[PDB]
Amino acid sequence: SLTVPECAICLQTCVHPVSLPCKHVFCYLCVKGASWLGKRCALCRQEIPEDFLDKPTLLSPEELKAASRGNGEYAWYYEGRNGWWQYDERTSRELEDAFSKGKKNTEMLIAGFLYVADLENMVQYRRNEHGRRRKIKRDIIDIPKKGVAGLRL
Amino acid sequence: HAMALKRIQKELSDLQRDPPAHCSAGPVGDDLFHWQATIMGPPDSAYQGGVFFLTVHFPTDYPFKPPKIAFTTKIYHPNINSNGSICLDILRSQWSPALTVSKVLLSICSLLCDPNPDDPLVPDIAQIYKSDKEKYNRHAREWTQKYAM
Ligand SMILES: Nc1ncnc2c1ncn2[C@@H]1O[C@H](COP(=O)(O)O)[C@@H](O)[C@H]1O[C@H]1O[C@H](COP(=O)(O)O)[C@@H](O)[C@H]1O
Ligand SMILES: [Zn+2]
Ligand SMILES: [Zn+2]
């Protein structure tokens, strides 16, 4: 397929598609979100390795490297331990849209939970519990970073 | 249950934009986990001209489990009983998250056109389907007129 495969969980084009041992493909963050519920492969019920979120098999690792240098001028980042993580490309488009329109905030689905992005104070937090807080920023692509959306680089 | 909610919202938007033939669906008020649906009996089916009302309820871990879909309108059919339960493999073990309510609705329309007597939820009706098809069609049309028009 010349096109990026569709994810059977969210019904969108896969973002950071990962391949399970059974060879089904899903967004990394949809797999992560389904892990909170203890799910197996959504399509065939076969096991997802215990360490999959820490060492996922990427459908195209080269495309991750390209994402971490890909959107040209600017990117969005969220706070990690001793460094910044880059937002996934789909959430980044939502943030950019909201920011560019002057919205004070917007909501994002990230790995099975709704987050508020507070664009006035540049912080994100889980909508249900405001204590889970991470600083965000909108900076150039060429900075040091931990990875993209939890995927190491 | 935000994964389910967003998946359901996406299906709704896609359905209301390009609705399946013979079908209508939408949420009950502001509650995305409960929908109502309507099927107009397919042309050339024995159910033609019938209006059938259905209920859809989504599980909190959707799309990992299928929606619960039932007929609220009485119908004469080997795969649909008086409680409105629908005997269809993709609402049981053959559910896949690759499917949508839209696709289930079309499969239900397909079942109306071509019942499956080898999955006999209503045995008496299934036997008539197999032994006397003209009688089956007569009864299905009679019940359509009586209960669904
Ligand atoms: N914007 C986001 N994008 C991707 N995942 C997120 C995001 N926000 C939260 N999560 C994930 O949701 C979970 C709860 O985050 P919390 O408590 O804040 O709501 C976490 O797994 C979050 O993932 C992050 O933290 C992980 C560890 O990185 P270190 O802190 O060691 O740098 C790493 O995977 C990283 O991506
Ligand atoms: Zn997905
Ligand atoms: Zn699988």
Side-chain angles (χ1 to χ4, degrees):
Chain A
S1 184
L2 278 0
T3 57
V4 177
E6 183 179 323
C7 172
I9 293 165
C10 66
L11 295 184
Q12 315 275 9
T13 305
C14 287
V15 174
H16 305 301
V18 298
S19 194
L20 300 179
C22 59
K23 298 183 172 162
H24 288 110
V25 180
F26 306 99
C27 310
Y28 174 67
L29 290 177
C30 289
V31 173
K32 184 161 177 165
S35 75
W36 309 132
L37 305 166
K39 296 299 189 190
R40 293 173 78 99
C41 174
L43 287 166
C44 76
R45 293 173 318 283
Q46 285 184 2
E47 198 176 12
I48 297 164
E50 182 81 303
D51 69 347
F52 196 78
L53 298 180
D54 294 4
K55 301 204 307 193
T57 300
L58 280 23
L59 185 68
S60 31
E62 66 281 357
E63 216 64 24
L64 175 53
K65 192 171 166 71
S68 79
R69 73 172 78 189
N71 26 333
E73 206 100 60
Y74 63 88
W76 286 86
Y77 298 89
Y78 60 98
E79 184 189 356
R81 279 188 287 286
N82 309 297
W84 292 101
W85 293 101
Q86 192 175 320
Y87 277 93
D88 79 86
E89 65 159 69
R90 174 171 289 139
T91 309
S92 298
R93 287 192 292 277
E94 174 56 38
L95 295 166
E96 190 57 21
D97 181 75
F99 181 80
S100 77
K101 291 182 194 321
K103 295 189 180 167
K104 287 140 196 253
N105 50 64
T106 186
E107 289 188 6
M108 356 170 237
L109 177 69
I110 308 187
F113 294 90
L114 282 175
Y115 284 81
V116 174
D118 174 341
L119 298 181
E120 285 190 282
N121 297 293
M122 299 298 285
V123 74
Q124 72 157 48
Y125 58 80
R126 196 171 269 194
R127 195 190 157 204
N128 73 49
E129 180 198 354
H130 294 219
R132 285 169 133 83
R133 264 158 193 266
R134 294 178 188 261
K135 274 69 202 153
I136 66 186
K137 71 173 185 167
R138 178 189 183 262
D139 205 337
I140 65 171
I141 286 185
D142 195 17
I143 54 160
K145 62 194 81 164
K146 300 196 62 156
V148 181
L151 301 163
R152 299 303 305 208
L153 244 41
Chain B
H1 314 110
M3 173 195 66
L5 177 53
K6 288 283 168 304
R7 163 70 179 251
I8 293 159
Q9 282 168 342
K10 163 65 170 164
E11 284 196 38
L12 186 64
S13 175
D14 292 339
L15 182 155
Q16 298 193 326
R17 180 185 293 107
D18 294 302
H22 313 306
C23 304
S24 178
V28 178
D30 294 353
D31 179 16
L32 281 291
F33 284 78
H34 291 93
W35 297 6
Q36 252 254 139
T38 300
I39 298 162
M40 174 84 71
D44 309 310
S45 86
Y47 309 99
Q48 64 174 13
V51 184
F52 303 95
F53 300 118
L54 288 77
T55 58
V56 186
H57 180 65
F58 294 95
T60 62
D61 61 346
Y62 192 71
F64 282 81
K65 284 183 183 74
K68 193 92 71 203
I69 303 183
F71 273 70
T72 57
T73 304
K74 189 167 176 63
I75 185 171
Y76 186 88
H77 199 282
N79 310 122
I80 311 168
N81 67 15
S82 52
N83 293 336
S85 301
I86 303 171
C87 202
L88 179 58
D89 64 350
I90 60 168
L91 293 171
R92 315 186 295 253
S93 93
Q94 299 300 285
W95 173 254
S96 157
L99 300 173
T100 60
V101 171
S102 178
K103 291 162 172 184
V104 178
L105 289 172
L106 294 169
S107 302
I108 297 171
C109 290
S110 167
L111 207 62
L112 266 36
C113 296
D114 287 287
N116 190 1
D118 301 333
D119 200 0
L121 188 61
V122 185
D124 288 14
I125 294 183
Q127 286 310 113
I128 294 159
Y129 185 82
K130 291 196 281 186
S131 68
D132 195 341
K133 202 134 181 279
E134 185 245 295
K135 182 161 196 273
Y136 174 85
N137 287 331
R138 166 164 75 257
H139 289 170
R141 287 187 326 263
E142 286 173 350
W143 280 36
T144 303
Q145 294 162 12
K146 189 147 189 277
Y147 305 115
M149 298 185 182

